[PDB]
Write a protein that binds this ligand. Structure first.
Ligand SMILES: Cc1ccc(NC(=O)c2ccc(CN(CCN(C)C)C(=O)c3cccnc3)cc2)cc1Nc1nccc(-c2cccnc2)n1
Ligand SMILES: [Cl-]
Ligand SMILES: [Cl-]
Ligand SMILES: [Cl-]
Length: 285
């Protein structure tokens, strides 16, 4: 495969995330970049605890990444090690890490700029996520776990959608609730995913609305203070929706409301979301 990179071209680093069978670590790649002899990357791999279902899953993820091709707002595949060893997937490294912790870090200095984040930045993140999801939708790729924790931020404030997957400890993460044999991100899920096991680009649009709530609360937990229990499920069914977060404009909140239509087909497309948000950007962008 043309994606193949020699394993001995890597020096492995500090762990960036781990779950039960997988992890992602920082690494240095020699001779991988054509313009840079030495470069920092991120590498995904399995732990010795991993079984065939995991190895299969990681190979399947590599295949989907190659098939999708590149996009500015999707974490960028750089290579892989699949022969004569445990499988590694290599991507770009993103300077600021995940969007949740970045927003939290930025709470004190929020200005609404080198001095801190503004509404413009929040709208930029909103727009870039929509573009990334528009790209995935155009390849018929349904994300199923869209959330700010699965958005990375590169040094130029460029959003990169990912899915930690096996490199997140879903069994020990309050964002994932036991619902069957696995843990699911219930507070981000569309009702038809919760109740009917239906996942589509339209359920990704619901999750996108929840992600916007995360952005405009500077990394708040959706449905703050609400446990996922029978009362939660009844509330969603009865039509309960989150109120506008403090840094959102009325137009941004209108967008979240649209994304949370009970009927999936009534939710707006990621194409239209991208165009609408772009139109909300101020002149200096
Ligand atoms: C190394 C590394 C290896 C692999 C990946 N690959 C993915 O995350 C991934 C790619 C494609 C897909 C495919 N699917 C369909 C399947 N799902 C329905 C299951 C999507 O829906 C989809 C498509 C496209 C995007 N997101 C979701 C799923 C997951 C990322 C990283 N990098 C990575 N990962 C985590 C953290 C960092 C990090 C941390 C801190 C600083 N700097 C960097 N970097
Ligand atoms: Cl760095
Ligand atoms: Cl239920
Ligand atoms: Cl808020």
């Amino acid at each position: 495969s043309r994606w193949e990179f020699p394993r001995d071209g890597l020096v492995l680093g500090r762990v960036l995330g781990s779950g039960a069978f997988g992890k992602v670590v920082e690494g240095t790649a020699y001779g991988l970049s054509r313009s840079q002899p030495v470069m920092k990357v991120a590498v995904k791999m399995l732990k010795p605890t991993a079984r065939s279902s995991e190895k299969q899953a990681l190979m399947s993820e590599l295949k989907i990444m190659t098939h999708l091709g590149p996009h500015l707002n999707i974490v960028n595949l750089l290579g892989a090690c699949t022969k004569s060893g445990p499988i590694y997937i290599i991507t770009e490294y993103c300077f600021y890490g995940d969007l949740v912790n970045y927003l939290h870090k930025n709470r004190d200095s929020f200005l609404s700029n080198s001095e801190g984040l503004t509404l413009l930045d929040l709208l930029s993140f909103t727009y870039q996520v929509a573009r990334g999801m528009e790209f995935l939708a155009s390849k018929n790729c349904v994300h199923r776990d869209l959330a700010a924790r699965n958005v990375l931020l590169a040094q130029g404030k460029i959003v990169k959608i990912c899915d930690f997957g096996l490199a997140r400890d879903i069994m020990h993460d309050s964002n994932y609730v036991s619902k069957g044999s696995t843990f699911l991100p219930v507070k981000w899920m569309a009702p038809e995913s919760i109740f009917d096991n239906l996942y589509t680009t339209l359920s990704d649009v619901w999750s996108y609305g929840i992600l916007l709530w995360e952005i405009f609360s500077l990394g708040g937990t959706p449905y703050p203070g609400m446990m996922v229990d029978s009362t939660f499920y009844n509330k969603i069914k009865s039509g309960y929706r989150m109120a506008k977060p403090d840094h959102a404009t009325s137009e941004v909140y209108e967008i979240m409301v649209k994304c949370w239509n009970s009927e999936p087909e009534k939710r707006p497309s990621f194409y239209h979301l991208s165009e609408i948000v772009e139109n909300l950007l101020p002149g200096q962008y």
